[PDB]
């Protein structure tokens, strides 16, 4: 039905209108803590805040604020943590969160710099031989390896708690070619990237929620998560076609504002869920066709 639905909307060109309806109907919950004066400097954007009911709380008894939201998708049974791109002063908080929430993967969908603007801090080591230490949160971070592809890069990081001298492996999945307020090049490139993430196990129920961010943590992040959850649902339901993408997006917006920032991102999500259904419904070969089409070399 969603492909039937997708057809009417394109045919009549109503993406902007359909998108404005989602915006009109989205939830509005208080952001009290995010707005406290002492937390001014912990927010990259003063108009993108986590809701109080779903914000992630740092376990430091001084100030527990981080701009980050737990997105708990019940029917689909996946949780994601959506966050803003760490600021030079909240890098220690970010990794505190990753440690405390027991996350195994981090998905970064932006670049540190876009159109000459600073969009995110360099919060992970670019060189094996130069590790990072976050003094405020007593954590250590070390680049272990990095498989670089044409449009993304997977890294293996070692995060160590200096307090307890325990270490974990964190996988880092950086999509380098997704412009702010833009879409990926193709459904193929996106889906190929999403499936690399799934295949790493980082999304396994046995780990904390994967951390997903871009600069603000709503647009590309929202797009990434919607598509994933919708595909998840088409798998579970005895009826894959029933899945209403607009409804899933509204469910998700109960947990963080603004998810999906443009009408073209919404359109893209349909493309990606539709295409990705092919795999859900048995076409084994289709995944190799996204690898050849995404041009990951």
């Amino acid at each position: 039905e969603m492909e039937k639905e997708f057809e009417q909307i394109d045919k009549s060109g109503s993406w902007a209108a359909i998108y404005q309806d989602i915006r009109h109907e989205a939830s509005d919950f208080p952001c009290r803590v995010a707005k406290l004066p002492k937390n001014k400097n912990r927010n990259r954007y003063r108009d993108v805040s986590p809701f109080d009911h779903s914000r992630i709380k740092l376990h430091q008894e001084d100030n527990d604020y981080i701009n980050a939201s737990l997105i708990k998708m019940e029917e689909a049974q996946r949780s994601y943590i959506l966050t803003q791109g760490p600021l030079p002063n909240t890098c220690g908080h970010f990794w505190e969160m990753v440690w405390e929430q027991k996350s195994r993967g981090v998905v970064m969908l932006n670049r540190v710099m876009e159109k000459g603007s600073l969009k995110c801090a360099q919060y992970w080591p670019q060189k094996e031989e130069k590790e990072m230490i976050f003094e405020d949160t007593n954590l250590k971070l070390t680049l272990i390896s990095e498989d670089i592809k044409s449009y993304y890069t997977v890294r293996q990081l070692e995060l160590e708690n200096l307090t307890t001298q325990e270490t974990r492996e964190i996988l880092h999945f950086h999509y380098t070619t997704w412009p702010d307020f833009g879409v990926p090049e193709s459904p193929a490139s996106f889906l190929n990237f999403l499936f690399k993430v799934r295949e790493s196990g980082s999304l396994s129920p046995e780990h904390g929620p994967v951390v997903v961010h871009c600069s603000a943590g709503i647009g590309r992040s929202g797009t990434f998560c919607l598509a994933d959850t919708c595909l998840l649902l088409m798998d579970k339901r005895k009826d894959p076609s029933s899945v209403d993408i607009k409804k899933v997006l509204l469910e998700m917006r109960k947990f963080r504002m603004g998810l999906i920032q443009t009408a073209d991102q919404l359109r893209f999500s349909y493309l990606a869920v539709i295409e990705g259904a092919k795999f859900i419904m048995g076409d084994s070969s289709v995944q190799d066709q996204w690898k050849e089409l995404s041009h990951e070399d």
Partner: peptide, 6 residues
Amino acid sequence: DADEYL
């Protein structure tokens, strides 16, 4: 400003 995404 710069502290606004929207």
